Amino acid sequence: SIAVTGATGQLGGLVIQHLLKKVPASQIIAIVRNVEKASTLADQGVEVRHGDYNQPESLQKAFAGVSKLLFISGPHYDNTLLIVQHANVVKAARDAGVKHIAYTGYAFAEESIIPLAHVHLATEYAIRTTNIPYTFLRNALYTDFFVNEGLRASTESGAIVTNAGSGIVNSVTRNELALAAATVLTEEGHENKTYNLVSNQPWTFDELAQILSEVSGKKVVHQPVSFEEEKNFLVNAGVPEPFAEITAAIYDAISKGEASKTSDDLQKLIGSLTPLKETVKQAL
């Protein structure tokens, strides 16, 4: 019995589709905040349960009798609130007698300068307190954050504008990260282990721009700018202030080597990784 929180979200939806290739739908439980959004899952053989991280009682019920739990992190912007939610989740899983928990954390968190990394470490320590056999799935930033349909704005202008400088990026796709979680949940050998699930073929924004140029046939350059120019760029392109700030801070951190370390853990878990060109062409 494998339960997946965040099941209607992007990552959780992909996990379930990967689990559906490995186990009967019978064994999969989707735990979800909005039960009406989960109908398509229930049309597949997947059991749907209500579980809201803000409501301990819902989590008690949702985790009842689950063997393996994949706890996908909350997306909230308030990190201090996210620590409460995650704590509620961990306490509910302990009380429910969950037998194995996997948690989607953040690669190389101890060296991060992004405050969200402190949430993932707080949560990993919270899970260690339960004594439940664990797998810490320490996910890179998503390649999809940087490479998406929004790249058409850059083809248009001839420029990818960021404040990442020549920082290196070890991102991987949500889909490879979903496969990794599904792999771990469906095979032995991953108990009490941490994996830093990142690329071993990192890239730069110069390189991304050369790739976009090759694919589109149109000349695009990386235009690196300052933090304040980025946030301005973003706000004036219709990106709401808090998210524009979040985004500039992620690029700023990249410029300082936040995403520059690599591991073979993911490749060892899922096999060959998707080349960035292949992801760029899909995005377009």
Ligand X SMILES: NC(=O)c1ccc[n+]([C@@H]2O[C@H](COP(=O)([O-])OP(=O)(O)OC[C@H]3O[C@@H](n4cnc5c(N)ncnc54)[C@H](OP(=O)(O)O)[C@@H]3O)[C@@H](O)[C@H]2O)c1
Helix or strand run (H / E) with residue 231: helix 227-236
Please tell me the distance from the alpha carbon of residue 115 to that of residue 130, in angstroms, as a whole number.
24
From the CB of 94, what's the least distance to ligand X, in Å?
18
From the CB of 12, what's the least distance to a copy of itself, in Å?
23
DSSP assignment string, the chain = -EEESSTTSHHHHHHHHHHHTTS-GGGEEEEES-GGGGHHHHHTT-EEEE--TT-HHHHHHHTTT-SEEEEPPP--S-HHHHHHHHHHHHHHHHHTT-SEEEEEEETTGGG--STHHHHHHHHHHHHHHHT--EEEEEEPPBHHHHSSTTHHHHHHHTEEEES-TT-EE--B-HHHHHHHHHHHHTSSS-TTEEEEE--SS-EEHHHHHHHHHHHHSS--EEEE--HHHHHHHHHHTT--HHHHHHHHHHHHHHHTTTT----SHHHHHHSSPPPHHHHHHHH-
Q: Which does 46 bind (CB under 5 to 8 A by kind): a copy of itself, ligand X, none?
A: none
Q: Which does 79 bind (CB under 5 to 8 A by kind): a copy of itself, ligand X, none?
A: a copy of itself
- Indicate the residue type of 46: V
Is 9 among the annotated ligand-binding positions?
A: yes
Helix or strand run (H / E) with residue 2: strand 2-4
Site for ligand X in 89-118 (CB under 6 A): 104
Of 217 and 242, CB closest to ligand X: 242
Is 8 among the annotated ligand-binding positions?
A: yes
Of 49 and 86, CB closest to a copy of itself: 86
**Residue 90 binds to a copy of itself (criterion: CB under 8 A):** yes
**Residue 75 binds to ligand X (criterion: CB under 6 A):** yes
Please identify, among the stretches 123-131, 163-171, 204-212, 236-244, the one whose residues bind a copy of itself according to the rule CB under 8 A: 123-131
Of 78 and 187, CB closest to a copy of itself: 78
User: Considering only residues 76, 118, 193, 277, which one is a binding residue for a copy of itself as defined by CB under 8 A?
Assistant: 118
Site string for a copy of itself, 126-145 (x = CB under 8 A): x-xxxx--------------
Please identify, among the stretches 71-79, 186-194, 211-219, 275-283, the one whose residues bind ligand X according to the rule CB under 6 A: 71-79
The binding site for ligand X (CB under 6 A) comprises 6, 8-12, 33-34, 37, 51-54, 72-75, 104, 139, 141-142, 145, 174
The binding site for a copy of itself (CB under 8 A) comprises 79-84, 87-88, 90-91, 94, 115, 118-119, 121-123, 125-126, 128-131
Instruction: Detail the residues annotated as belonging to a binding site for NADP(+).
Output: 8-11, 33, 52-54, 73-74, 140, 142, 174
